[PDB]
Design a protein around this ligand. Structure first.
Ligand SMILES: Nc1ncnc2c1ncn2[C@@H]1O[C@H](COP(=O)(O)OP(=O)(O)OP(=O)(O)O)[C@@H](O)[C@H]1O
Ligand SMILES: Nc1ncnc2c1ncn2[C@@H]1O[C@H](COP(=O)(O)OP(=O)(O)OP(=O)(O)O)[C@@H](O)[C@H]1O
Ligand SMILES: [Mg+2]
Ligand SMILES: [Mg+2]
Ligand SMILES: [Zn+2]
Lengths: 618, 308
């Protein structure tokens, strides 16, 4: 690096792209492809300056880096998306402009490449039943334009060696406070001068570059062109669907598998999974949310071990399309209701068979959970730590984060669910409802060990529990909302927001501190609710007692209610049990968010109402 | 400029032949008739108005200056994108490398604000907004059936305001002869009130300055550079620098009634975005200005503001 220049890479859009998905596979594909775009961008920087010049994210142990650059033989860990959509690196000033243009190009070409490969794959597999000439229309400018313009890869940079009046640079950038002016003072101290080199105020420079960078990103993301008129994609309903400008709605639908016309971007999305398979021989263990749901209490395994064979038999009987590789094509065929709506008498056998199995093994899990985690105030906590030595401590921080995301997050999830993204302090995972809480807790705990009553490094999270039939787009929106508007809205953050969205539309939300999970798990209250509808009316009555302040006060009302619903086998047991349950309720109240005792009881009992719902936790 | 005020109501299609009355009795449902009521659809008026709506034409002859929503508190608008949450703080542009930038001060948290507050904001008199002054609109939940079940959600709203510039279509007279009008592509009907005056928010006087701002109150269609260009020519002033505070583009579709097909997708700067401009010489900031494409369909309504 001749003339050191700080460079920032930003790739958008993120959440809107991930949310435009119908199946878990699309969701994983969007996320993974996003990480892939960042990787393509970073390799441009590595080629010219090596990984040591990439401050964030930390490439060193990045699966993508080990397998696609240093060419190693890493396994399924390659399936996880570990690279965030933003990066910071130090490069050469005279090279920066080339690098900018160079990154926009490799990302553009890569996407067009995936698109053409997707068109070929689509036609050769029935995805789209079209002519021979019509296949060439799929590659016309109109569709190519959509691929080329969907993502924005923005790069901005600033010289680390140019000198400037530190006070005036931060003042003009709207960053001058007392704490900042004080820091600037100690800086003017070290170097007997106020006119220092940009890297002299590195911590404040990162923040400024972020703003300069954001200005550019909004200017570039709006430089889009219009699209041709026509029917839109069924998955995102935003972009023109291929052949959407040549056919009427009905004829357009008949050309596509499952009758769902796709736009250029969602076609790449459907193809991405196979592309990755061909490139790494790897594919995600759970492809549908239903696959993640059936992991509840090992139902899937259990059922397969005592009904797996026959079901496939009776399935193949009704039809040969439902079976393949001696296993069902879709996991939803595990639900009686699927056969009744999606050779009549030949089907009656399947339904009666499944219903019968549910009698001995129990009804199949129909709810699953979406876990989103995200570091609280990382921007301030990082610059605070960093506040030519500074950049090094920043690299150290980034490596600590990549290590955590790549090895530790992966370790608690194991094969208990699907870990889609883990880019440092942030996480996106699909888990069976009976693992969600524990998994989130462990990730929060590990995070605390890797960065250490009043912790400075915290993670907030959103856990949304939904029915397998719920539109994934809406579920992601609600999971994000639980994280951003509920958990992150609590003063002091470091909160877990739990939402249960029933198929009926009812929506229950509880805001809790992390330790509620520990205290509840080890509680006598938890054991007593599981062996009781005593739990249901106890929860109903307490909630009714806190729609307003109870005249007799919270403590007295809780003791009264505990007495009315909690009982043992003999006066001896029941007394100790009532004293134990009462005390655990009080300990739990310590960990529920809320402006007062009434709100805390409400939140706790709403939480209890959630984890004792028989439909969700059969 | 006429001001049309809509009071929307959902339509409940009831049958005189029903199975169990215990149901509607438990809900205490009452069905009272509405005598002498003048209903009608916008799909029928668009009644001689054929002379102002081009057949196969994208825009009409008249111009829909814009649309604003209202609750019990009156007219409300998206909280300006440069107002960050902590209390909500107003953050003005800073500078670096000679370029206008938005200093980092927290995440934007969406919400609405009353015309009163927006008015103080546009005059540069607003430093912060107490959180209880920021509005959050509850979503309405409906089960949609196209004419497959759908999930239809939309803001819980009391009023819809439409500002119209009529070159000579006699729109005020047509609308004034109706009390109710059913909306487009929905089982919703609305009461119609028409006032022959232009709203205060458009008659403001900001004076003259070099540091002006433009708040996008309706989605504005166009690339940033184009909008900044149109602004320079419209105000006959040169812009030395600008900053667009926004989120991401919003996809605008539309139905092409002539083609019996959906219109091509267009991308727009969303309502709430603010364009900060620094002119070479003083300009007298207009109270409002129309920018971008499809102006006649309500897009491009920008309200003039000031900053220092
Ligand atoms: N590849 C990914 N897969 C899943 N989550 C990701 C991925 N990349 C980033 N993320 C998460 O998404 C967050 C950003 O979401 P968002 O949609 O707000 O993007 P943004 O960079 O803020 O762009 P915008 O200006 O559109 O908001 C990142 O901070 C990170 O937490
Ligand atoms: N290791 C890092 N080094 C430099 N920047 C980082 C690093 N890790 C993350 N970042 C940046 O910090 C940003 C924080 O984004 P986010 O939207 O989460 O804000 P936050 O500061 O974490 O506050 P909160 O999450 O509480 O709203 C990440 O999106 C990324 O842009
Ligand atoms: Mg964060
Ligand atoms: Mg964002
Ligand atoms: Zn699409």
């Amino acid at each position: 690096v001749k003339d050191p220049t700080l460079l920032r890479i930003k790739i958008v859009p993120v959440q809107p792209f991930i949310a435009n998905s119908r199946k878990q596979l699309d969701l994983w594909a969007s996320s993974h492809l996003l990480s892939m775009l960042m990787y393509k961008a970073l390799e441009v920087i590595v080629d010219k300056f090596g990984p040591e010049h990439v401050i964030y994210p930390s490439l060193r142990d990045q699966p993508f880096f080990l397998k696609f650059y240093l060419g190693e033989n890493i396994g399924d860990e390659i399936l996880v998306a570990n690279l965030p959509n933003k990066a910071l690196a130090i490069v050469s000033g005279k090279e920066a402009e080339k690098i900018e243009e160079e990154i926009k190009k490799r990302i553009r070409d890569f996407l067009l490449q995936l698109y053409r490969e997707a068109v070929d794959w689509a036609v050769e597999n029935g995805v789209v039943k079209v002519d021979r000439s019509e296949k060439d229309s799929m590659l016309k400018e109109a569709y190519l334009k959509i691929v080329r313009e969907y993502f924005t890869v923005s790069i901005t940079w600033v010289s680390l060696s140019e000198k400037e009046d530190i006070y005036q640079v931060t003042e003009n950038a709207g960053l001058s406070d007392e704490d900042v002016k004080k820091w600037l003072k100690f800086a003017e101290k070290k170097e007997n001068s106020r006119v220092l080199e940009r890297i002299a105020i590195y911590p404040l420079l990162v923040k400024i570059l972020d703003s300069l960078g954001e200005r550019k990103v909004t200017e570039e993301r709006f430089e889009k062109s219009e699209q041709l008129k026509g029917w839109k994609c069924h998955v995102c309903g935003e972009n023109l669907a291929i052949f959407g400008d040549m056919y009427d709605h009905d004829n357009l639908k008949s050309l596509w598998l499952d009758e769902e016309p796709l736009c250029p971007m969602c076609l790449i999305k459907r193809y991405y999974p196979v592309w990755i398979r061909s490139k790494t021989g790897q594919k995600i263990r759970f492809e549908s949310v239903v696959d993640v749901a059936l992991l509840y209490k090992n139902w899937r395994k259990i059922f397969d071990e005592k009904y797996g064979k026959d079901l496939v038999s009776k399935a193949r009987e009704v039809s040969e399309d439902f079976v393949k590789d001696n296993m069902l094509v879709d996991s939803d065929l595990y639900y009686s209701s699927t056969w009744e709506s999606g050779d009549e008498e030949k089907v009656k056998e399947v339904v009666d068979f499944l219903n019968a199995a549910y009698k001995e093994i129990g009804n199949p899990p129909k709810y699953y959970a979406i876990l989103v985690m995200d570091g609280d105030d990382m921007g301030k906590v990082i610059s605070g730590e960093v506040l030519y030595s500074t950049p090094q401590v920043h690299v150290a921080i980034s490596q600590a984060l990549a290590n955590f995301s790549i090895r530790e997050v992966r370790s608690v999830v194991k094969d208990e669910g699907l870990l889609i993204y883990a880019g440092g302090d942030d996480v996106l995972a699909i888990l069976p409802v009976d693992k969600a809480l524990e998994v989130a807790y462990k990730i929060r705990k590990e995070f605390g060990k890797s960065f250490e009553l009043l912790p400075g490094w915290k993670l907030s999270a959103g856990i949304l529990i939904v029915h397998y039939k719920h539109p994934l787009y809406d579920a992601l929106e609600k999971a994000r909302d639980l994280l951003n508007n509920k958990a992150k809205n609590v003063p002091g953050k470091d909160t877990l927001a739990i939402g249960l969205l029933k198929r009926s539309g009812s929506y229950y939300i509880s805001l809790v501190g992390w330790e509620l999970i520990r205290v509840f798990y080890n509680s006598e209250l938890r054991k007593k609710l599981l062996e009781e509808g005593v739990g249901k009316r106890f929860i109903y009555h307490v909630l009714r007692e806190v729609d307003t302040w109870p005249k007799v006060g919270i403590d007295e009302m809780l003791k009264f209610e505990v007495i009315r619903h909690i009982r043992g086998r003999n006066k001896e047991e029941t007394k100790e049990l009532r004293e134990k349950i009462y005390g655990e309720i009080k300990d739990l109240l310590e960990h529920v968010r809320g402006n007062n005792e009434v709100e805390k009881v409400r939140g706790l009992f709403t939480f209890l109402k959630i984890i004792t719902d028989a439909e969700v936790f059969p | 400029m006429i001001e049309v005020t809509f009071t929307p109501y959902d339509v409940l299609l009831f049958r005189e032949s029903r199975p169990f009355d215990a149901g509607s009795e438990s809900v205490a449902r009452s069905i009272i008739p509405l005598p002498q009521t003048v209903a009608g659809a916008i799909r029928t008026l668009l009644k001689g108005l054929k002379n102002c709506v081009g057949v196969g034409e994208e825009e009409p002859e008249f111009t829909l200056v814009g649309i604003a929503i209202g609750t019990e508190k009156g007219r409300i608008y998206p909280l300006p994108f440069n107002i960050i949450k902590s209390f909500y703080k107003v953050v003005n542009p800073g500078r670096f490398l000679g370029k206008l930038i938005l200093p980092p001060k927290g995440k934007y948290k969406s919400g609405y604000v009353t015309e009163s507050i927006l008015e103080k904001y546009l005059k540069g008199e607003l430093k912060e907004v107490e959180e209880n002054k920021v509005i959050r609109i509850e979503k309405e939940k409906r089960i949609g059936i196209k004419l497959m079940l759908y999930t239809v959600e939309f803001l819980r709203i009391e009023k819809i305001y439409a500002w119209i510039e009529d070159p000579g279509c006699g729109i005020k007279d047509i609308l004034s002869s109706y009390e109710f009008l059913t909306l487009g592509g929905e089982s919703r009907v609305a009461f119609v009130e028409v006032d022959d005056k232009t709203p205060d928010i458009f008659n403001r006087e900001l004076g003259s300055t070099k540091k002006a701002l433009f708040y996008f109150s309706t989605p504005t269609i166009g690339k940033v550079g184009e909008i900044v260009q149109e602004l320079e020519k419209r105000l006959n002033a040169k812009i030395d620098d600008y900053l667009l505070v926004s989120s991401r583009p919003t996809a605008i579709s539309g139905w092409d009634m002539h083609e019996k097909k959906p219109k091509g997708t267009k991308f727009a700067i969303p309502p709430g975005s603010v364009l900060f401009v620094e002119f070479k010489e003083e300009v007298e900031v207009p109270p409002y200005i129309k920018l971008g494409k499809l102006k006649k369909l309500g897009y491009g309504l920008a309200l003039g503001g000031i900053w220092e």
